[PDB]
Amino acid sequence: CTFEYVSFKNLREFVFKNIDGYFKIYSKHTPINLVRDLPQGFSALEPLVDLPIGINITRFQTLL
């Protein structure tokens, strides 16, 4: 508990990774034409956040 921080037609993309005790997040947003699978094309994700937290992540879960 030693840390806290605050700040189908749409595709939201993200990347999450942990390196050298820093936990990094990236993203991109776009409209899409066909919702049945990820659209074949290219548009790179850009960083949002680079957290100092030092945690050993091995598993994850999602909320809705």
């Binding site: 030693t2 050298d20 005790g21 820093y22 100092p52 030092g54 945690i55 050993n56």
Partner: peptide
């Protein structure tokens, strides 16, 4: 003083195994 104690880069782990210094 018993309040100061010991057991990847910049990792932290509070799980338990711990000993104070003397």
């Amino acid at each position: 003083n018993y309040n100061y104690l010991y057991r990847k880069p910049f990792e932290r782990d509070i799980s338990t195994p711990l000993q104070s210094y003397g």
